[PDB]
């Protein structure tokens, strides 16, 4: 996190680079630093320099830009804007100049900015756009042609260019000119999905403290501006924090769910605004309005808070244009696969300068032959075959109904370990229905009533009817499932004029029935909102104040969970068998949520629920959905850990887990509870064993005390660990962080609000009831069920085998035609000019981007992919498979040279003059099959993909190269004119060579199934390692030594 400055000697730097040829390597390589100073102009001053670099521990560069108003020098970094202060000498964030700002301050902005402060501000913080930048195509050309792999390719066009073979050289540059649009295409929609996701482009009002009213489009906002919000509704401009009135939102484009919210005013007083206590009080960038009410005044007052790319979104923007990088890695061994593999190389090329030197030929055609040689081993269609690969899986997943950003973390879900859920929305209904309400009389409860309609006019029924934040939205009431569920249940329907405190938010009416029971003793009458005080995860709570035609004086209601209501109620108001009544609901997996009153004596949070009194419990029921026990089932049978985290209770969760297979019958559990230390003593880690492998079930509180109190158990815990409940938001992105920190693959389904955090913070999120592509995790689904959970993995896994037939096959070719030119060397051939282009597209790279297309397997399995290019088999598979096809082609030419018919080829006339000689026709189709035979072999079926048939492009290919190569070898000649074949002129050999190259199809097969079936048993029997690396395995095997609960 260094970053250190410097300011005609830059042109000479450029030219020695230029005479160096190479010099770029040396700057992309260990020593990047040294040749930035030596061509930067070195200059420690950071007042006096224009460029920058920062470290951090990677390495980036960036110019410094200054405007004028006098002077402001400041740059860009990561999207973030940093300026240069005269006063500090340093640079300081734009977003940390109004840090500490109180809420007093932004109460008094209320007023206008000046047009004249708008404009430094403006100049300041910039433009209010998150800015993502449209590409120019040579741009992108530029960018992307620009690596050392199509340089190479390009020097490779040039060398065969060299030596009239224009045919190749062509196709090299078709090629290559293919995966650059293949390249620029990826890049083009990736950066398109994310542009057109930020466009904020309207006019909004906002008022100047003379004349009070101007329209602006969205970029001319500033931090600090006041903000006329539409009451009809629409789109956030900005960042802002509600000043005055009230706000029903919809923030699920950074939220996940999808349900109104209730923003209310900023609390006047002192104390800083931190944006995060006071989320219930600001408006975020890029969320809908459904409506605004001023209820104190005409309009309805914001003030701009962050603009540009410090908002939320504008963060999540960031991240995704600059993500962090994987920490699990996918390969982190390939440098020594290709090292191995030019060390083949390179002992093939000593064959071939020495057997050059040994005829005559020029030194200058010899180094030639040499550099031919070295470019034929580079294959240019693998960036192809790896784009088209990440294309067609990514294809693959938004058909199956699911969007992944950035396709790059495609391939963790083939690699998953341990997943978690989220009771409510995710594994359960999002529904609910209301089985009744348990009343109190003074400290005893009751009976529970069904229908809640029957209850007499008193605190709970007004409770019940009046503690929500439900709107109504084109006659319709909307919000919360429970609160609409709530509502209905009681009949009160949501229908100025203030009672004592302030303006009525909402009034309601209670349902005319019952002339005579109605009417039996004080009939209902209506009741009026004065505060509402909205809900959040972290505080299981929500507080409402109300009045009505009687209320000598107001009455609050609070509703919220029972262990927590219970704890704010009076003491002497509840009942000492609160516990186990509270269980013996949730025990039977009923959502239980109580409802508590104070009557008020005529108003921040705090004051609110203090002395509150149980009015009852709220009893109902959350079914699990349809779909969920037979994929926890089946993510249980493949040795996929599952974890449930939840807020919900402790009872509950476990009813649930039991019901949905989490923990299966025979399976025992223990509850971890630890006891907050009393100033005597630490907590004490208390377990209970429950009654119907080893499962253990905590809560939040517990949960926290063990990470602050009990870190040595911590690790115990987490492994065996898999039901927490009752934990805020941030206590479950922490779990995440510890499982990650266990060495665990973690992924994450979520419904919102609670998970996002948690969601960001796993290696693989995924987010249910989202419309489309979002920002909220980096996998989303459109379906609202857990079956989006498998199939990430299953194509993840899909994936992971999909590259890695790719690198066997493409490595294949790469030397099976390595070999074959080098034999045609010993002769003194060189394998035709247009059998190169034969061999590069119509055979190998449609082959190539085919071969990915085929799909996941439909069910998952308990082997995992590899993760190593350099395993055991792997290699095993690639020599053996070299044995078997250079023992192919050996035979062929031996048996071609014992013929009765034979002429050597003029070994006295270099190639392509002597051609087709006889022994260039036969290794020509010899490695064409050959082609096609790895082609067909290296791709696999079963676990991870389909079985070969099933991509019917695929299939025809191969059928028709095969077909095509048939008749090349079996007929009189059609092509033989333009591929310089020699047609062999007999209709006996050639059906022994079609015979022999059957052979080599067969033992293809036969060889990669016999490795398959024998060298995993081998090497189980051979090599007993005890894998060790990962902690989360050593703790598995320490606990199976001997459990740690005993
Ligand atoms: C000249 C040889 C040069 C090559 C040197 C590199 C050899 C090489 O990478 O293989 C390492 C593996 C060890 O195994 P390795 O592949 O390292 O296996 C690890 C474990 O499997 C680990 O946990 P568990 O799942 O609990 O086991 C996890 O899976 C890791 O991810 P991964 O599996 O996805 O990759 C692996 O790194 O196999 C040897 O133990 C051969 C050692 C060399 C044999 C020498 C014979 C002469
Ligand atoms: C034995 C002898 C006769 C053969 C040597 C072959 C050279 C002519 C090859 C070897 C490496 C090649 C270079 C590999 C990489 C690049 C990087 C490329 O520039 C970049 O894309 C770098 C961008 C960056 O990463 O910042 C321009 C072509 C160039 C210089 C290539 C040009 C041709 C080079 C010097
Ligand atoms: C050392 C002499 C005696 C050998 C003569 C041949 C060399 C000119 C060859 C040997 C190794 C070759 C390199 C082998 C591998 C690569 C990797 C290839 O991939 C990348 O580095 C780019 C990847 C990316 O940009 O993502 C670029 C060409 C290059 C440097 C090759 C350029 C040509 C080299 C230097
Ligand atoms: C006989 C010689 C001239 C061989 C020429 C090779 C072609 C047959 C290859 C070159 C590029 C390939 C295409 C490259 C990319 C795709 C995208 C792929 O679809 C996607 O993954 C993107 C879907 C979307 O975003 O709409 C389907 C295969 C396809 C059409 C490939 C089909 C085969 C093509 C045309
Ligand atoms: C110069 C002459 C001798 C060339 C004659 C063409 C053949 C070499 C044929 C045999 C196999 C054919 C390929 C077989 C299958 C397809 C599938 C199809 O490509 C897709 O994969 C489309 C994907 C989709 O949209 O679903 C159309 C072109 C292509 C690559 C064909 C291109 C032409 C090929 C290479
Ligand atoms: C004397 C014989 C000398 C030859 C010795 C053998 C050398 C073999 C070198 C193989 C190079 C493998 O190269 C590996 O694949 C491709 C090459 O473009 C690169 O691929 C990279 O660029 C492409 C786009 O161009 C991206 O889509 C891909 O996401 C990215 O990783 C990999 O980052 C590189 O690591
Ligand atoms: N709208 C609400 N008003 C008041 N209390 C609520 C409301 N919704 C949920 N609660 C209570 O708050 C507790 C936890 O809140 P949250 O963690 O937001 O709910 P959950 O539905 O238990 N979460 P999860 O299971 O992870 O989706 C729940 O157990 C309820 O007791
Ligand atoms: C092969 O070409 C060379 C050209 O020099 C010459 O020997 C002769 O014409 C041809 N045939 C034989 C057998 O050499
Ligand atoms: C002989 C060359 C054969 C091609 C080998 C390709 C292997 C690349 C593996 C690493 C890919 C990510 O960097
Ligand atoms: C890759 C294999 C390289 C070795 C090729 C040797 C060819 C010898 C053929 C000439 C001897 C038969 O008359
Ligand atoms: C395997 C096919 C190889 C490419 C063949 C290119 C020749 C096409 C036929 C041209 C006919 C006129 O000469
Ligand atoms: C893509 C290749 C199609 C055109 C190839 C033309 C080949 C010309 C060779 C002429 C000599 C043999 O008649
Ligand atoms: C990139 C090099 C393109 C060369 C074009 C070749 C066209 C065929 C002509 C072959 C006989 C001169
Ligand atoms: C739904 C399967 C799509 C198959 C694509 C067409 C395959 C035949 C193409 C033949 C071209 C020569
Ligand atoms: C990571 C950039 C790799 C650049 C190619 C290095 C080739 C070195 C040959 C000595
Ligand atoms: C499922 C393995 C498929 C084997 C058949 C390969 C294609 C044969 C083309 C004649
Ligand atoms: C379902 C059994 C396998 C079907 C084979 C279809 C492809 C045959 C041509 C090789
Ligand atoms: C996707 C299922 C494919 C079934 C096999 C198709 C065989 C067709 C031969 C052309
Ligand atoms: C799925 C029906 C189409 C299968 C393709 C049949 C072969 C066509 C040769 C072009
Ligand atoms: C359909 C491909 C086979 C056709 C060959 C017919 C003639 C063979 C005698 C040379
Ligand atoms: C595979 C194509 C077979 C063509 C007919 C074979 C005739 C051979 C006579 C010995
Ligand atoms: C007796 C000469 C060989 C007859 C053909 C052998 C079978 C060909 C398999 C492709
Ligand atoms: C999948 C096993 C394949 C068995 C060998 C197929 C030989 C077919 C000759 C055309
Ligand atoms: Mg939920």
């Keep these: 996190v260094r970053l250190s400055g410097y300011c005609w000697r830059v042109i000479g730097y450029h030219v020695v680079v230029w005479m160096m040829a190479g010099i770029p390597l040396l700057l992309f390589r260990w020593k990047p630093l040294w040749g930035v100073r030596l061509r930067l102009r070195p200059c420690n001053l950071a007042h006096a320099e224009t460029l920058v670099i920062e470290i951090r521990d990677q390495l980036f560069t960036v110019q410094v ?19 240069w202060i005269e006063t500090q000498q340093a640079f300081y964030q734009v977003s940390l100049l109004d840090h500490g700002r109180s809420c007093d301050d932004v109460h008094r902005s209320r007023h206008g900015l000046s047009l004249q402060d708008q404009m430094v501000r403006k100049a300041i913080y910039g433009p209010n756009v998150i800015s993502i930048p449209v590409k120019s195509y040579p741009q992108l050309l530029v960018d992307e042609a620009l690596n050392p792999y199509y340089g190479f390719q390009a020097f490779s066009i040039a060398l065969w260019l060299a030596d009239h073979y224009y045919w190749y050289a062509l196709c090299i540059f078709l090629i290559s000119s293919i995966s650059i649009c293949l390249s620029l295409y990826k890049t083009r929609k990736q950066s398109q999905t ?19 009213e101007e329209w602006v489009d969205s970029s001319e906002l500033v931090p600090g501006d006041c903000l006329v919000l539409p009451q009809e509704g629409g789109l956030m401009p900005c960042d802002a924090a509600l000043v005055a009135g009230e706000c029903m939102v919809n923030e699920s484009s950074l939220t996940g769910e999808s349900i109104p919210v209730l923003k209310t005013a900023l609390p006047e007083g002192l104390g800083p605004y931190c944006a995060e206590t006071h989320r219930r009080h600001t408006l975020f960038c890029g969320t809908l309005i459904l409506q605004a009410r001023a209820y104190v005044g005409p309009h309805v007052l914001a003030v701009v808070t962050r603009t540009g790319f410090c908002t939320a979104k504008g963060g999540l923007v960031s991240s995704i244009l600059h993500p962090r990088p994987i920490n699990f890695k996918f390969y982190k061994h390939s440098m020594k696969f290709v090292a191995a593999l ?30 031919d040689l070295v470019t034929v081993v580079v294959p240019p269609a693998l960036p192809a075959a790896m784009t088209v690969c990440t294309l067609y899986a990514q294809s693959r997943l938004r058909r199956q109904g699911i969007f992944c950003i950035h396709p790059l973390r495609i391939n963790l879900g083939g690699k998953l370990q341990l997943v978690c859920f989220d009771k409510t929305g995710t594994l359960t209904e999002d529904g609910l229905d209301v089985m009744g309400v348990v009343p109190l009389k003074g400290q005893a409860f009751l009976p529970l009533v069904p229908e809640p309609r029957r209850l007499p006019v008193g605190p709970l029924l007004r409770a019940l009817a009046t503690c929500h934040a439900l709107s109504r939205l084109q006659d319709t009431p909307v919000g919360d499932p429970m609160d609409l569920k709530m509502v209905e249940s009681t009949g009160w329907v949501l229908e100025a004029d203030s009672a004592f405190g302030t303006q009525v938010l909402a009034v309601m009416r209670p349902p005319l029935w019952e002339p005579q029971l109605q009417a039996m003793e004080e009939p209902p009458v209506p009741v009026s909102v004065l505060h509402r005080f909205p809900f959040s995860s972290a505080l299981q709570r929500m507080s409402v104040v109300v009045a009505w035609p009687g209320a000598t004086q107001p009455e609050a209601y609070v509703k919220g969970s029972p262990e927590l209501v219970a704890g704010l109620c009076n003491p002497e108001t509840v009942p000492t068998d609160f516990a186990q009544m509270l ?46 026990t037979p994929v926890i089932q089946a993510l249980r049978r493949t040795r996929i850990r599952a974890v449930m985290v939840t807020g919900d209770n402790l009872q509950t969760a476990v009813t649930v887990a039991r019901g949905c297979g989490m923990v299966a019958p025979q399976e ?18 208390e377990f209970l064993p429950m009654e119907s492998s080893r499962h253990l079930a905590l809560s939040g509180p517990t949960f926290g005390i063990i990470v602050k109190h009990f870190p040595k158990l911590l690790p115990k815990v987490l492994v065996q660990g898999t039901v927490f409940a009752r934990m805020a938001p941030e206590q479950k992105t922490e779990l995440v962080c510890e499982l990650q920190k266990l060495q665990y693959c973690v992924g994450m389904c979520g419904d919102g609000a609670n998970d996002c955090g948690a969601l960001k913070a796993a290696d693989v999120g995924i987010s249910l009831s989202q419309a489309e592509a979002s920002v909220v995790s980096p996998f989303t689904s459109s379906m609202a069920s857990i079956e989006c959970v498998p199939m ?22 790469s030397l099976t035609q390595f070999i074959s030119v080098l034999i045609l060397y010993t002769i003194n051939t060189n394998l035709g000019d247009l059998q190169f282009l034969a061999i590069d597209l119509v055979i190998t790279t449609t082959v190539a981007v085919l071969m990915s297309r085929t799909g996941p397997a439909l069910v998952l ?22 044995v078997l096809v250079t023992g192919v082609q050996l035979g062929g030419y031996f048996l071609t040279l014992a013929q009765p018919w034979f002429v050597p080829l003029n070994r006295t006339v270099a190639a392509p003059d002597n051609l087709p000689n006889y022994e260039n ?25 389909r079985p070969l048939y099933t991509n019917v492009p695929f299939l025809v290919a191969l059928a028709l190269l095969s077909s095509v190569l048939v008749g090349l070898v079996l007929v009189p000649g059609l092509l033989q004119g333009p591929l310089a074949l020699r047609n062999i002129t007999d209709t006996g050999f050639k059906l022994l060579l079609l015979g022999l190259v059957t052979l080599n199809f067969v033992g293809a097969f036969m060889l990669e199934s016999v490795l398959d079936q024998c060298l995993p048993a081998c090497l189980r029997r051979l090599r007993p390692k005890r894998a060790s690396k990962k902690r989360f395995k050593q703790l598995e095997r320490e606990l199976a030594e001997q459990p740690w609960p005993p």
């Excluded at 399995?861 to 070299?882: E, K, T, Y």
């Design 65 to 83: 830009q200054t405007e004028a108003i006098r002077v402001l020098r400041y740059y860009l970094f990561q999207g973030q804007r940093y300026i």
């Design 194 to 212: 994310l542009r057109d996701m930020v466009k904020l482009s309207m006019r909004v009002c906002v008022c100047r403290p003379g004349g009070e």
């Design 342 to 371: 030019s060390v083949l190389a390179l002992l093939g090329t000593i064959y071939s300068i020495f057997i050059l030197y040994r005829n005559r030929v020029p030194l200058n055609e010899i180094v030639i032959r040499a550099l």
């Design 583 to 628: 269980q013996s609901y949730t025990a039977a997996g009923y959502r239980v949520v109580a409802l508590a009153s104070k009557p008020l004596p005529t108003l921040t949070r705090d004051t609110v629920e203090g002395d509150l009194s149980l009015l009852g419990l709220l009893v109902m029921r959350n079914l699990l959905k349809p779909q969920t």
């Design 668 to 685: 025992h559990l223990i509850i971890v509870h630890a006891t907050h230390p009393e100033r005597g003593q630490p907590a004490s880690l």
């Design 792 to 813: 990430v993995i299953r194509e993840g896994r899909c994936s992971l085998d999909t590259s890695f037939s790719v690198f066997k096959y493409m490595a294949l070719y």
């Design 861 to 882: 399995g308990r082997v995992r992919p590899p993760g190593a290019l350099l395993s055991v088999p792997v290699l095993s598979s690639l020599l053996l498979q070299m």
């Design 921 to 945: 026709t036969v290794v020509f189709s010899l490695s064409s099959f050959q082609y096609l035979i790895l082609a067909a072999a290296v791709s696999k079926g079963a676990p991870f993909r």
